[PDB]
Amino acid sequence: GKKVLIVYAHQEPKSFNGSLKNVAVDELSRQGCTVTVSDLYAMNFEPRATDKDITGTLSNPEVFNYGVETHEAYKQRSLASDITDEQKKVREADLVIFQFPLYWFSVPAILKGWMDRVLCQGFAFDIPGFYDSGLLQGKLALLSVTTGGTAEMYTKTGVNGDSRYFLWPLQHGTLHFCGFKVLAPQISFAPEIASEEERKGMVAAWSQRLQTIWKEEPIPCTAHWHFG
Amino acid sequence: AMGKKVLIVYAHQEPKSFNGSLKNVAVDELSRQGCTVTVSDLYAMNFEPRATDKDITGTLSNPEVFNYGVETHEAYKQRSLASDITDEQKKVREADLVIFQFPLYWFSVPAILKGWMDRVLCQGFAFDIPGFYDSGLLQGKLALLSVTTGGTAEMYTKTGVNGDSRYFLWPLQHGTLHFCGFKVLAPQISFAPEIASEEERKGMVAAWSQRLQTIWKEEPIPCTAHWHFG
Ligand SMILES: Cc1cc2nc3c(=O)[nH]c(=O)nc-3n(C[C@H](O)[C@H](O)[C@H](O)COP(=O)(O)OP(=O)(O)OC[C@H]3O[C@@H](n4cnc5c(N)ncnc54)[C@H](O)[C@@H]3O)c2cc1C
Ligand SMILES: Cc1cc2nc3c(=O)[nH]c(=O)nc-3n(C[C@H](O)[C@H](O)[C@H](O)COP(=O)(O)OP(=O)(O)OC[C@H]3O[C@@H](n4cnc5c(N)ncnc54)[C@H](O)[C@@H]3O)c2cc1C
Ligand SMILES: Nc1c2ccccc2[nH+]c2ccccc12
Ligand SMILES: Nc1c2ccccc2[nH+]c2ccccc12
Ligand SMILES: [Zn+2]
Numbered sequence: 500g501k502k503v504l505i506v507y508a509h510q511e512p513k514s515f516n517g518s519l520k521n522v523a524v525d526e527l528s529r530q531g532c533t534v535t536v537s538d539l540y541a542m543n544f545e546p547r548a549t550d551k552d553i554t555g556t557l558s559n560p561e562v563f564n565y566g567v568e569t570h571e572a573y574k575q576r577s578l579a580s581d582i583t584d585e586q587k588k589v590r591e592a593d594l595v596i597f598q599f600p601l602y603w604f605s606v607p608a609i610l611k612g613w614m615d616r617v618l619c620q621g622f623a624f625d626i627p628g629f630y631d632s633g634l635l636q637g638k639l640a641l642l643s644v645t646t647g648g649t650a651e652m653y654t655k656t657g658v659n660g661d662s663r664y665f666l667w668p669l670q671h672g673t674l675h676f677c678g679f680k681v682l683a684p685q686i687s688f689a690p691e692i693a694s695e696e697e698r699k700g701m702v703a704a705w706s707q708r709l710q711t712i713w714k715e716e717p718i719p720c721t722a723h724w725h726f727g
Numbered sequence: 728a729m730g731k732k733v734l735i736v737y738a739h740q741e742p743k744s745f746n747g748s749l750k751n752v753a754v755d756e757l758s759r760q761g762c763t764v765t766v767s768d769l770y771a772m773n774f775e776p777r778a779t780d781k782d783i784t785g786t787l788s789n790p791e792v793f794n795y796g797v798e799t800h801e802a803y804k805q806r807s808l809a810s811d812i813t814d815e816q817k818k819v820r821e822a823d824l825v826i827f828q829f830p831l832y833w834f835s836v837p838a839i840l841k842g843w844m845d846r847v848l849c850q851g852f853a854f855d856i857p858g859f860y861d862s863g864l865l866q867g868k869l870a871l872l873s874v875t876t877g878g879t880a881e882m883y884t885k886t887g888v889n890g891d892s893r894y895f896l897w898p899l900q901h902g903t904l905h906f907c908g909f910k911v912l913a914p915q916i917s918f919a920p921e922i923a924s925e926e927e928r929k930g931m932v933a934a935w936s937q938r939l940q941t942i943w944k945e946e947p948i949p950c951t952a953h954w955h956f957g
């Protein structure tokens with residue numbers, strides 16, 4: 500009985516991200532997993548980190564510090580319900596898949612806000628309690644990314660540099676920081692110019708991999724797997 | 728000559744914050760020099776971070792299947808992007824220097840500002856095909872990240888826990904700013920104001936004030952895959 504959370508950030512159901520998300524739902528479910536989906540755009544998820552994220556009264560009214568206030572709110576069960584809803588989903592998940600098109604070598608703002616607001620201190624990490632000692636230890640995480648740029652453009656000698664440059668902030672900076680074990684990202688390069696067959700090739704590749712997903716080795720997340 | 732233009736894209740909730748202070752020092756110094764300074768205070772504007780179909784005000788080209796990149800590109804051409812987007816582009820178009828002032832969130836920009844990049848820097852406006860990197864459409868403009876961090880300077884080196892700072896900079900400076908044709912000036916990184924001594928804080932403010940005095944004469948950094956990981 501494995502739980503899976505797919506955090507999904509595309510505006511369009513009939514999109515290539517959309518298909519990757521659907522396949523993952525279908526395949527994983529077929530194996531007896533419980534798959535929950537956070538369809539950020541459909542939820543019209545709030546990306547701004549504001550004082551409205553605390554329901555209670557503020558630890559300090561005159562000066563607002565988002566980090567400090569959300570920390571306190573987490574422990575005191577005073578965070579806004581949309582945040583706590585996500586946290587619950589994350590908490591129960593054995594695996595968290597992030598499904599998104601690359602925007603500016605990163606996640607779309609709506610998914611960046613989910614990270615900013617959901618992964619708060621006390622919940623995803625603490626001091627001490629980060630990187631290997633992070634609070635979400637024991638959970639698995641996979642980035643499923645699509646790109647406009649082709650694979651060659653994402654090499655050490657392409658116009659974009661190596662892909663591990665855009666993976667760093669998310670995989671090390673964010674996921675490893677919270678204690679996740681990061682599986683190899685799934686990157687579908689340039690589906691928009693790919694052919695019908697290659698697109699299906701790509702969707703098929705994702706489907707296949709998901710079959711044996713729970714047997715995979717977490718990548719060694721360090722400053723040697725991304726720039727060397 | 729009185730009046731030459733800076734846009735500060737500001738991403739912090741609190742006026743009395745350290746970021747707030749850095750923003751006011753820039754406004755004050757650049758104004759003292761006789762520059763026009765415009766500030767997009769994103770949180771006060773309640774700026775919309777989400778890339779959605781509400782960003783286009785015409786009839787969609789393909790209503791049955793929404794493609795954000797395609798639709799905004801065409802909207803840009805029809806001059807029918809949302810006014811919030813179009814207002815930001817006006818500010819970018821007129822500026823000679825764009826400063827982004829923000830606290831580091833998850834080795835990157837706060838979502839509200841990520842939304843600004845997503846929505847404001849659309850195809851046809853900031854880049855095209857051809858017309859990116861060296862031929863980016865915002866060529867002839869200066870850009871500067873002014874970032875505050877939770878981590879200490881030592882924490883952001885090769886041997887520190889967060890790795891070299893150049894890794895979190897790469898996506899912003901090369902992937903976004905260079906891609907758009909900006910000339911990128913070296914980042915101002917103010918490390919850990921929250922836990923630094925009152926003395927270290929004032930120096931960080933003074934150091935920023937001082938750099939701004941000759942900011943226009945500064946040489947852009949070499950935007951190279953060797954500038955971040957070599
Ligand atoms: C603001 C912004 C910033 C961006 N920044 C970057 C960047 O920094 N780097 C970069 O490389 N790119 C960037 N891009 C481009 C972006 O990443 C790609 O456009 C995106 O990943 C495409 O994914 P998609 O789901 O939208 O593809 P889609 O447009 O949905 O897919 C294209 C085609 O695949 C078809 N398809 C769907 N399902 C199947 C199926 N199962 N099998 C057969 N075909 C199928 C669709 O019908 C469609 O015709 C950016 C885009 C925007 C809008
Ligand atoms: C969701 C989230 C994610 C984060 N991710 C990261 C990350 O990936 N990496 C990382 O390193 N950090 C991270 N942080 C920490 C964050 O970057 C820092 O908290 C932030 O940069 C501090 O800047 P500030 O303006 O908010 O500080 P403030 O708390 O506003 O300032 C600290 C002190 O400076 C004082 N001050 C203001 N003006 C002056 C003045 N003119 N002269 C003297 N003192 C003054 C204030 O009074 C205050 O006491 C994250 C925080 C959050 C909430
Ligand atoms: N901002 C970008 C795009 C926006 C709309 C459509 C395609 C895009 N491709 C990109 C490729 C590399 C960097 C930025 C890109
Ligand atoms: N991911 C981080 C944070 C997330 C939420 C609140 C505060 C944070 N401080 C950090 C300081 C250093 C590195 C990562 C940090
Ligand atoms: Zn790591």
Ligand SMILES: [Zn+2]
Nearest residue numbers: 901905950951
């Ligand atoms: Zn570059």
